[PDB]
Protein backbone atom coordinates (compact mmCIF):
# COMPACT_ATOMS: atom_id res chain seq x y z
CA UNK A 1 0.00 0.00 0.00
CA UNK A 2 1.66 3.15 -1.32
CA UNK A 3 -0.73 5.20 0.82
CA UNK A 4 1.21 4.02 3.86
CA UNK A 5 4.61 5.13 2.53
CA UNK A 6 6.29 8.19 4.05
CA UNK A 7 6.50 11.26 1.73
CA UNK A 8 9.41 11.35 -0.71
CA UNK A 9 11.03 14.70 -1.56
CA UNK A 10 13.35 13.21 -4.17
CA UNK A 11 16.75 14.44 -5.51
CA UNK A 12 15.62 17.60 -7.31
CA UNK A 13 16.04 21.01 -5.67
CA UNK A 14 12.62 22.65 -6.05
CA UNK A 15 10.28 23.59 -3.20
CA UNK A 16 6.90 22.41 -4.54
CA UNK A 17 4.11 21.89 -2.00
CA UNK A 18 2.28 18.59 -2.47
CA UNK A 19 0.02 16.33 -0.39
CA UNK A 20 0.56 12.87 1.05
CA UNK A 21 -1.71 10.61 3.02
CA UNK A 22 -0.58 10.39 6.64
CA UNK A 23 -2.10 7.12 7.84
CA UNK A 24 -1.11 7.90 11.45
CA UNK A 25 -3.10 11.16 11.52
CA UNK A 26 -5.80 9.83 9.24
CA UNK A 27 -5.52 12.79 6.88
CA UNK A 28 -3.65 14.25 3.94
CA UNK A 29 -0.85 16.64 4.82
CA UNK A 30 1.50 18.88 2.92
CA UNK A 31 5.21 18.22 2.34
CA UNK A 32 7.96 19.66 0.16
CA UNK A 33 8.50 17.82 -3.13
CA UNK A 34 11.76 18.45 -4.98
CA UNK A 35 10.34 18.30 -8.48
CA UNK A 36 11.30 14.88 -9.74
CA UNK A 37 10.99 11.14 -9.16
CA UNK A 38 7.69 11.32 -7.31
CA UNK A 39 6.43 8.18 -5.59
CA UNK A 40 2.70 7.45 -5.56
CA UNK A 41 1.82 9.02 -2.19
CA UNK A 42 2.20 12.50 -3.73
CA UNK A 43 -0.86 14.53 -4.80
CA UNK A 44 -1.49 17.98 -6.18
CA UNK A 45 -4.50 18.61 -3.93
CA UNK A 46 -6.07 17.35 -0.73
CA UNK A 47 -9.13 16.20 -2.71
CA UNK A 48 -7.08 13.92 -4.96
CA UNK A 49 -5.27 12.60 -1.91
CA UNK A 50 -8.49 11.82 0.00
CA UNK A 51 -10.08 10.18 -3.05
CA UNK A 52 -7.11 7.88 -3.67
CA UNK A 53 -5.92 7.18 -0.11
CA UNK A 54 -8.62 8.29 2.30
CA UNK A 55 -9.29 5.65 4.93
CA UNK A 56 -6.13 3.59 4.30
CA UNK B 1 21.59 27.90 -0.15
CA UNK B 2 23.33 26.21 2.82
CA UNK B 3 26.44 27.89 4.18
CA UNK B 4 26.21 31.03 2.09
CA UNK B 5 25.82 34.73 2.76
CA UNK B 6 23.25 37.48 2.13
CA UNK B 7 23.89 38.81 -1.38
CA UNK B 8 22.63 42.31 -0.71
CA UNK B 9 19.58 43.83 -2.41
CA UNK B 10 19.60 43.54 -6.21
CA UNK B 11 23.29 42.63 -6.42
CA UNK B 12 22.26 39.60 -8.55
CA UNK B 13 19.99 41.50 -11.05
CA UNK B 14 19.47 38.44 -13.26
CA UNK B 15 18.04 36.25 -10.49
CA UNK B 16 14.30 35.60 -10.75
CA UNK B 17 11.76 33.84 -8.56
CA UNK B 18 9.19 31.52 -10.12
CA UNK B 19 5.93 31.93 -8.19
CA UNK B 20 2.79 29.76 -8.18
CA UNK B 21 1.23 31.22 -5.06
CA UNK B 22 4.63 30.90 -3.34
CA UNK B 23 8.27 30.70 -4.45
CA UNK B 24 9.00 27.20 -5.79
CA UNK B 25 12.04 27.65 -8.10
CA UNK B 26 14.57 30.22 -9.25
CA UNK B 27 15.62 31.20 -12.77
CA UNK B 28 17.88 33.55 -14.76
CA UNK B 29 16.89 36.42 -17.03
CA UNK B 30 18.76 36.04 -20.35
CA UNK B 31 17.00 38.89 -22.19
CA UNK B 32 14.07 41.26 -21.59
CA UNK B 33 11.48 38.61 -22.39
CA UNK B 34 13.14 35.26 -21.66
CA UNK B 35 14.09 33.31 -18.54
CA UNK B 36 16.01 30.03 -18.29
CA UNK B 37 15.31 27.56 -15.45
CA UNK B 38 15.16 23.83 -14.87
CA UNK B 39 12.82 21.49 -16.70
CA UNK B 40 11.62 19.86 -13.47
CA UNK B 41 10.35 23.34 -12.43
CA UNK B 42 7.73 23.22 -15.20
CA UNK B 43 4.33 24.20 -13.81
CA UNK B 44 1.19 25.87 -15.13
CA UNK B 45 0.29 29.35 -13.94
CA UNK B 46 3.84 30.53 -13.38
CA UNK B 47 4.35 34.16 -12.38
CA UNK B 48 7.93 35.40 -12.76
CA UNK B 49 9.15 37.88 -10.16
CA UNK B 50 12.03 40.18 -11.03
CA UNK B 51 13.88 42.75 -8.96
CA UNK B 52 13.28 40.70 -5.80
CA UNK B 53 15.32 40.68 -2.63
CA UNK B 54 12.90 39.98 0.22
CA UNK B 55 10.39 37.66 -1.48
CA UNK B 56 7.89 38.17 1.33
CA UNK B 57 7.44 41.95 1.27
CA UNK B 58 6.84 44.37 -1.59
CA UNK B 59 9.90 46.62 -1.55
CA UNK B 60 9.25 48.66 -4.69
CA UNK B 61 11.80 47.39 -7.24
CA UNK B 62 9.69 44.36 -8.27
CA UNK B 63 8.16 43.45 -11.59
CA UNK B 64 5.74 40.51 -11.52
CA UNK B 65 5.11 39.20 -15.06
CA UNK B 66 3.22 36.06 -16.02
CA UNK B 67 4.74 33.48 -18.31
CA UNK B 68 3.18 33.23 -21.77
CA UNK B 69 5.09 30.11 -22.85
CA UNK B 70 7.19 27.45 -21.07
CA UNK B 71 9.48 25.38 -23.32
CA UNK B 72 11.00 22.25 -21.72
CA UNK B 73 13.93 20.75 -23.62
CA UNK B 74 12.54 18.17 -26.13
CA UNK B 75 14.97 15.58 -24.80
CA UNK B 76 14.43 16.21 -21.08
CA UNK B 77 14.28 12.86 -19.27
CA UNK B 78 12.37 12.98 -16.00
CA UNK B 79 13.92 9.73 -14.83
CA UNK B 80 17.63 10.40 -15.54
CA UNK B 81 17.33 14.19 -15.24
CA UNK B 82 19.32 14.57 -18.46
CA UNK B 83 18.63 17.82 -20.38
CA UNK B 84 17.10 19.51 -17.31
CA UNK B 85 16.61 22.92 -18.92
CA UNK B 86 13.57 25.05 -19.76
CA UNK B 87 12.90 28.43 -21.33
CA UNK B 88 10.12 30.70 -20.11
CA UNK B 89 8.81 33.51 -22.30
CA UNK B 90 7.43 36.49 -20.36
CA UNK B 91 3.98 37.75 -21.29
CA UNK B 92 5.49 41.24 -21.60
CA UNK B 93 9.09 42.42 -21.68
CA UNK B 94 10.71 43.39 -18.41
CA UNK B 95 12.11 46.91 -17.97
CA UNK B 96 15.87 46.42 -17.63
CA UNK B 97 20.56 48.18 -12.64
CA UNK B 98 18.27 46.21 -10.30
CA UNK B 99 16.99 44.02 -13.17
CA UNK B 100 19.42 42.98 -15.91
CA UNK B 101 20.08 39.91 -18.05
CA UNK B 102 23.03 37.51 -17.77
CA UNK B 103 25.25 36.52 -20.73
CA UNK B 104 25.30 33.02 -22.17
CA UNK B 105 28.70 31.26 -22.26
CA UNK B 106 30.96 31.23 -25.34
CA UNK B 107 32.81 28.19 -23.95
CA UNK B 108 32.49 25.62 -21.15
CA UNK B 109 34.09 26.36 -17.80
CA UNK B 110 36.89 24.25 -16.41
CA UNK B 111 37.26 22.43 -13.10
CA UNK B 112 38.42 24.80 -10.43
CA UNK B 113 36.54 27.77 -11.83
CA UNK B 114 34.95 29.76 -8.98
CA UNK B 115 31.24 30.53 -9.53
CA UNK B 116 28.40 32.35 -7.77
CA UNK B 117 25.26 30.36 -6.95
CA UNK B 118 22.18 32.19 -5.64
CA UNK B 119 18.66 31.43 -4.46
CA UNK B 120 15.94 31.61 -1.79
CA UNK B 121 16.11 27.91 -0.99
CA UNK B 122 16.53 26.12 2.35
CA UNK B 123 19.52 27.31 4.39
CA UNK B 124 19.76 24.18 6.61
CA UNK B 125 21.35 20.86 5.67
CA UNK B 126 19.62 19.05 8.52
CA UNK B 127 16.41 21.00 9.01
CA UNK B 128 14.25 23.66 7.37
CA UNK B 129 14.72 27.40 7.21
CA UNK B 130 13.70 29.41 4.15
CA UNK B 131 15.14 32.93 3.90
CA UNK B 132 13.31 36.20 3.14
CA UNK B 133 16.32 37.63 1.32
CA UNK B 134 18.47 36.25 -1.48
CA UNK B 135 21.44 34.12 -0.41
CA UNK B 136 24.72 33.69 -2.29
CA UNK B 137 27.49 31.10 -2.40
CA UNK B 138 30.87 30.94 -4.13
CA UNK B 139 31.70 27.35 -5.09
CA UNK B 140 34.19 25.90 -7.58
CA UNK B 141 33.34 23.69 -10.52
CA UNK B 142 34.56 20.11 -9.85
CA UNK B 143 36.21 17.75 -12.32
CA UNK B 144 34.08 15.31 -14.25
CA UNK B 145 35.98 12.42 -12.63
CA UNK B 146 35.13 13.36 -9.05
CA UNK B 147 31.54 14.15 -10.03
CA UNK B 148 31.18 10.68 -11.51
CA UNK B 149 32.85 9.18 -8.43
CA UNK B 150 30.27 10.93 -6.18
CA UNK B 151 27.30 9.80 -8.33
CA UNK B 152 28.16 6.52 -10.11
CA UNK B 153 26.34 6.00 -13.38
CA UNK B 154 24.24 9.13 -12.94
CA UNK B 155 26.33 11.90 -14.43
CA UNK B 156 25.82 12.61 -18.15
CA UNK B 157 27.83 14.93 -20.37
CA UNK B 158 25.18 17.59 -19.73
CA UNK B 159 25.80 17.77 -15.98
CA UNK B 160 28.57 19.16 -13.78
CA UNK B 161 29.25 19.09 -10.05
CA UNK B 162 30.15 22.15 -8.05
CA UNK B 163 30.76 22.64 -4.37
CA UNK B 164 32.86 21.16 -1.59
CA UNK B 165 33.49 17.50 -0.84
CA UNK B 166 33.66 18.41 2.84
CA UNK B 167 30.00 19.49 2.71
CA UNK B 168 28.48 22.44 4.58
CA UNK B 169 28.13 24.72 1.53
CA UNK B 170 25.60 23.81 -1.19
CA UNK B 171 22.30 24.61 -2.93
CA UNK B 172 19.11 23.10 -1.48
CA UNK B 173 15.23 22.90 -1.94
CA UNK B 174 14.00 26.15 -3.33
CA UNK B 175 17.15 26.79 -5.38
CA UNK B 176 16.33 24.66 -8.45
CA UNK B 177 16.45 26.56 -11.75
CA UNK B 178 18.66 29.26 -10.27
CA UNK B 179 21.97 30.51 -11.74
CA UNK B 180 25.58 29.28 -11.47
CA UNK B 181 27.53 32.26 -12.84
CA UNK B 182 31.25 32.15 -13.55
CA UNK B 183 33.26 35.01 -15.04
CA UNK B 184 30.00 36.83 -15.79
CA UNK B 185 28.53 34.05 -17.91
CA UNK B 186 25.72 31.68 -17.05
CA UNK B 187 27.35 28.24 -16.84
CA UNK B 188 24.89 26.18 -14.85
CA UNK B 189 21.34 25.72 -13.62
CA UNK B 190 20.70 24.32 -10.09
CA UNK B 191 19.32 20.85 -10.69
CA UNK B 192 19.75 17.97 -8.22
CA UNK B 193 21.89 16.27 -5.56
CA UNK B 194 21.76 13.81 -2.66
CA UNK B 195 20.47 15.91 0.21
CA UNK B 196 22.04 19.29 0.82
CA UNK B 197 25.57 20.09 1.93
CA UNK B 198 26.38 16.43 2.70
CA UNK B 199 30.05 15.36 2.70
CA UNK B 200 31.10 13.76 -0.61
CA UNK B 201 27.80 14.70 -2.25
CA UNK B 202 28.23 18.02 -4.11
CA UNK B 203 25.33 19.59 -6.00
CA UNK B 204 24.67 18.67 -9.65
CA UNK B 205 24.02 21.39 -12.25
CA UNK B 206 22.82 21.49 -15.88
CA UNK B 207 25.79 22.33 -18.15
CA UNK B 208 24.49 25.43 -19.97
CA UNK B 209 27.43 25.71 -22.42
CA UNK B 210 26.03 22.62 -24.19
CA UNK B 211 22.68 24.31 -24.93
CA UNK B 212 23.66 27.75 -26.17
CA UNK B 213 22.74 27.17 -29.82
CA UNK B 214 19.44 25.50 -28.80
CA UNK B 215 18.67 28.43 -26.50
CA UNK B 216 19.44 31.12 -29.12
CA UNK B 217 17.42 29.47 -31.89
CA UNK B 218 14.50 28.52 -29.62
CA UNK B 219 14.22 32.07 -28.30
CA UNK B 220 14.28 33.45 -31.85
CA UNK B 221 11.54 31.23 -33.20
CA UNK B 222 9.02 31.74 -30.38
CA1 LIG C 1 9.89 41.76 -2.56
UniProtKB/Swiss-Prot annotation, chain A:
Domain of life of the organism in this record? Answer: Eukaryota
GO cellular component assignments:
extracellular space; serine protease inhibitor complex
Keyword list (alphabetical) reads: Disulfide bond, Pharmaceutical, Protease inhibitor, Secreted, Serine protease inhibitor, Signal
Compartment list: Secreted
Coarsely, its chief localization is secreted
Q: Indicate the annotated site residue(s) for Reactive bond for trypsin.
A: 13-14
Q: One MF term in GO for this entry?
A: molecular function inhibitor activity
Q: Which residues form the BPTI/Kunitz inhibitor domain?
A: 3-53
State the disulfide connectivity.
3-53, 12-36, 28-49
Alphabetical GO biological process terms: negative regulation of platelet aggregation; negative regulation of serine-type endopeptidase activity; negative regulation of thrombin-activated receptor signaling pathway; trypsinogen activation
Function of this protein? Inhibits trypsin, kallikrein, chymotrypsin, and plasmin.
Q: What is this protein called?
A: Pancreatic trypsin inhibitor
Q: What is the lineage of its organism?
A: Eukaryota, Metazoa, Chordata, Craniata, Vertebrata
Q: Identify the segment of the full-length protein shown.
A: 38 to 93 of 100
Curated annotation (Swiss-Prot), chain B:
- Broad class of enzyme this protein falls into: hydrolase
Q: Which cofactor is essential here?
A: Ca(2+)
What is this protein called in UniProt? Serine protease 1
This protein's GO cellular component annotations are: extracellular space; serine protease inhibitor complex
What does UniProt list as catalytic?
A: 40, 84, 176
Please give the organism.
Bos taurus (Bovine)
Q: How is its activity regulated?
A: Is inhibited by scorpion cyclotide trypsin inhibitor TopI1.
Q: Which UniProt keywords apply?
A: Calcium, Digestion, Disulfide bond, Hydrolase, Metal-binding, Protease, Secreted, Serine protease, Signal, Zymogen
Amino acid sequence: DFCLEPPYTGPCMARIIRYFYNAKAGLCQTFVYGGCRAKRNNFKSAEDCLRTCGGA
Amino acid sequence: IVGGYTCGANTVPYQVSLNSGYHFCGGSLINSQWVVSAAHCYKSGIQVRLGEDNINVVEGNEQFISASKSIVHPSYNSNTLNNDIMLIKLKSAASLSRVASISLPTSCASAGTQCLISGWGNTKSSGTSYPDVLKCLKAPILSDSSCKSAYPGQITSNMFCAGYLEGGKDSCQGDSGGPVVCSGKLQGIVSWGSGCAQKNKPGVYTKVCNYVSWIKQTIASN
